[PDB]
Scaffold this active site. Structure first.
Site, mmCIF file in Angstrom:
data_model
loop_
_atom_site.group_PDB
_atom_site.id
_atom_site.type_symbol
_atom_site.label_atom_id
_atom_site.label_comp_id
_atom_site.label_asym_id
_atom_site.label_seq_id
_atom_site.Cartn_x
_atom_site.Cartn_y
_atom_site.Cartn_z
ATOM 1 N N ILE A 25 35.202 -5.774 -61.291
ATOM 2 C CA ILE A 25 33.975 -5.136 -60.834
ATOM 3 C C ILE A 25 32.993 -5.061 -61.984
ATOM 4 O O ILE A 25 31.774 -5.072 -61.783
ATOM 5 C CB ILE A 25 34.245 -3.715 -60.334
ATOM 6 C CG1 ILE A 25 34.987 -3.696 -59.014
ATOM 7 C CG2 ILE A 25 32.967 -2.959 -60.262
ATOM 8 C CD1 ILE A 25 35.412 -2.277 -58.664
ATOM 9 N N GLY A 26 33.523 -4.924 -63.192
ATOM 10 C CA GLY A 26 32.688 -4.663 -64.346
ATOM 11 C C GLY A 26 33.442 -4.882 -65.634
ATOM 12 O O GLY A 26 34.678 -4.936 -65.665
ATOM 13 N N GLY A 72 32.758 -3.638 -73.705
ATOM 14 C CA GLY A 72 33.208 -4.215 -74.950
ATOM 15 C C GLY A 72 34.626 -4.713 -74.812
ATOM 16 O O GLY A 72 34.868 -5.897 -74.547
ATOM 17 N N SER A 86 36.674 -3.293 -72.556
ATOM 18 C CA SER A 86 37.119 -2.799 -71.264
ATOM 19 C C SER A 86 36.889 -3.812 -70.143
ATOM 20 O O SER A 86 36.129 -4.774 -70.272
ATOM 21 C CB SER A 86 36.405 -1.489 -70.932
ATOM 22 O OG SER A 86 35.055 -1.526 -71.373
ATOM 23 N N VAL A 124 36.916 -3.199 -65.628
ATOM 24 C CA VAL A 124 37.182 -2.345 -64.484
ATOM 25 C C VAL A 124 37.386 -3.251 -63.281
ATOM 26 O O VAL A 124 36.569 -4.143 -63.030
ATOM 27 C CB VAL A 124 36.053 -1.319 -64.272
ATOM 28 C CG1 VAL A 124 34.706 -2.003 -64.104
ATOM 29 C CG2 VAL A 124 36.358 -0.396 -63.100
ATOM 30 N N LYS A 171 40.100 1.073 -64.714
ATOM 31 C CA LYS A 171 39.436 0.691 -65.955
ATOM 32 C C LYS A 171 40.484 0.379 -67.029
ATOM 33 O O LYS A 171 41.287 1.243 -67.396
ATOM 34 C CB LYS A 171 38.498 1.806 -66.413
ATOM 35 C CG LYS A 171 37.616 1.467 -67.606
ATOM 36 C CD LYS A 171 36.970 2.754 -68.110
ATOM 37 C CE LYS A 171 35.528 2.571 -68.572
ATOM 38 N NZ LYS A 171 35.402 2.516 -70.057
ATOM 39 N N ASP A 191 20.963 8.655 -71.831
ATOM 40 C CA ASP A 191 20.793 7.254 -71.485
ATOM 41 C C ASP A 191 21.180 7.007 -70.035
ATOM 42 O O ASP A 191 21.798 5.988 -69.710
ATOM 43 C CB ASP A 191 21.594 6.350 -72.414
ATOM 44 C CG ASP A 191 21.313 4.884 -72.163
ATOM 45 O OD1 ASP A 191 20.120 4.502 -72.179
ATOM 46 O OD2 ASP A 191 22.277 4.121 -71.924
HETATM 47 C C1 LIG Z 1 31.154 -0.405 -62.598
HETATM 48 N N1 LIG Z 1 32.425 0.292 -62.585
HETATM 49 C C2 LIG Z 1 32.903 0.850 -61.339
HETATM 50 N N2 LIG Z 1 32.523 0.268 -60.219
HETATM 51 C C3 LIG Z 1 32.907 0.714 -59.030
HETATM 52 N N3 LIG Z 1 32.455 0.051 -57.810
HETATM 53 C C4 LIG Z 1 31.591 -1.121 -57.879
HETATM 54 C C5 LIG Z 1 30.552 -1.225 -58.795
HETATM 55 C C6 LIG Z 1 29.765 -2.367 -58.827
HETATM 56 C C7 LIG Z 1 29.997 -3.385 -57.915
HETATM 57 N N4 LIG Z 1 29.215 -4.597 -57.953
HETATM 58 C C8 LIG Z 1 28.511 -5.007 -58.928
HETATM 59 C C9 LIG Z 1 27.608 -6.335 -58.401
HETATM 60 C C10 LIG Z 1 28.219 -6.843 -57.422
HETATM 61 C C11 LIG Z 1 29.162 -5.716 -56.842
HETATM 62 O O1 LIG Z 1 29.715 -5.690 -55.791
HETATM 63 C C12 LIG Z 1 31.037 -3.285 -57.005
HETATM 64 C C13 LIG Z 1 31.822 -2.150 -56.990
HETATM 65 O O2 LIG Z 1 32.862 -2.022 -56.075
HETATM 66 C C14 LIG Z 1 33.518 -3.217 -55.779
HETATM 67 N N5 LIG Z 1 33.699 1.762 -58.952
HETATM 68 C C15 LIG Z 1 34.142 2.425 -60.050
HETATM 69 N N6 LIG Z 1 34.949 3.521 -60.205
HETATM 70 C C16 LIG Z 1 35.090 3.800 -61.499
HETATM 71 C C17 LIG Z 1 34.368 2.861 -62.225
HETATM 72 C C18 LIG Z 1 34.247 2.788 -63.745
HETATM 73 N N7 LIG Z 1 34.143 2.707 -64.869
HETATM 74 C C19 LIG Z 1 33.752 1.984 -61.290
#
Ligand SMILES: CNc1nc(Nc2ccc(N3CCCC3=O)cc2OC)nc2[nH]cc(C#N)c12
EC number: 2.7.12.1
Length: 260
Positions: A16-17, A20, A22, A24, A38, A132
């Protein structure tokens, strides 16, 4: 691929993300439920990184006892090599949902506003100043806005940063106030109302920083129907921190209080 955390096994749907060190991922548990995990590889890591990552795990732990608007940390495995944090899973981040150049139901925007205030007010109550906040810092889950990064550790990006949300005191104080989060919440509301952030138009980021810190520069506030929203945005986006509206003021404002 899979992840065993504190005795439970989770299977990795999609990353998802990243950060540095890390990553997730969106994962399913043994019961085909959605979570986020994460991962932090600590092998390479100064003790300041180490210390920063440690701190916010703790603050995250306490803080979720006090608010639904902070994302939940169900569980965490931690060793000298890695971190695993099992967290409630967002649907997407505000900054991606905003750029699906949509337009926002004016009462969802008001509810999201309520949500950011609740969440930022909570961290403020235990002594934290994000200084921020951006849309990336908010996740949408159950038509709520929940916060994820307290600005303490090496923050993530959902799978190049931004400075439309920089408080002027941040630029000036280089040669902290809780009021500087009001600004960035300000820009996120402004953005959420006017489809653009205040100085989003000065595309060259030296001249943009000046504008932000510039008295006889005027943020434009096009008249609109909810004139309460226009007043909130106007008092969030004052350059003088002491003149800017507090979070406890914002929570006693007509915009959140009266059901129009
Ligand atoms: C960014 N980090 C997290 N992100 C999500 N959800 C989520 C976020 C973004 C996206 N995107 C991004 C572009 C395309 C798309 O679908 C999709 C997502 O869910 C599938 N849930 C979380 N919980 C704890 C987290 C931490 N640290 C955390």
């Amino acid at each position: 691929e899979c992840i065993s955390v504190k005795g439970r096994i989770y299977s990795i749907l999609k990353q998802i993300g990243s950060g540095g060190s890390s990553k997730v991922f969106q994962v399913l548990n043994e019961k085909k439920q959605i979570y986020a995990i994460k991962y932090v590889n600590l092998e390479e890591a100064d003790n300041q990184t180490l210390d920063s990552y440690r701190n916010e795990i703790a603050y995250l732990n306490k803080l979720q006892q006090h608010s639904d608007k902070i994302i939940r940390l169900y569980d965490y495995e931690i060793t000298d090599q890695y971190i695993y944090m099992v967290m409630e899973c967002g649907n997407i981040d505000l900054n991606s949902w905003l750029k699906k150049k949509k337009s926002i139901d004016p009462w969802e925007r008001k509810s999201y506003w309520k949500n950011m205030l609740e969440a930022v007010h909570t961290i403020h109550q235990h002594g934290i100043v994000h200084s921020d906040l951006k849309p990336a810092n908010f996740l949408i889950v159950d038509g709520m806005l929940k916060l994820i990064d307290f600005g303490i550790a090496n923050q993530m990006q959902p799978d190049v940063g931004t400075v439309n949300y920089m408080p002027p005191e941040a630029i000036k104080d280089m040669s902290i106030s809780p009021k500087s989060d009001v600004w960035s919440l300000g820009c996120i509301l402004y953005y959420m109302t006017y489809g653009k952030t205040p100085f989003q138009q000065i595309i060259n980021q030296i001249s943009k920083l000046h504008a932000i810190i510039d008295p006889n520069h005027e943020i434009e506030f096009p008249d609109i129907p909810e004139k309460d929203l226009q007043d909130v945005l106007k008092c969030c986006l004052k350059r003088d921190p002491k003149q800017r509206i507090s979070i406890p003021e914002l929570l006693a404002h007509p915009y959140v209080q009266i059901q129009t």
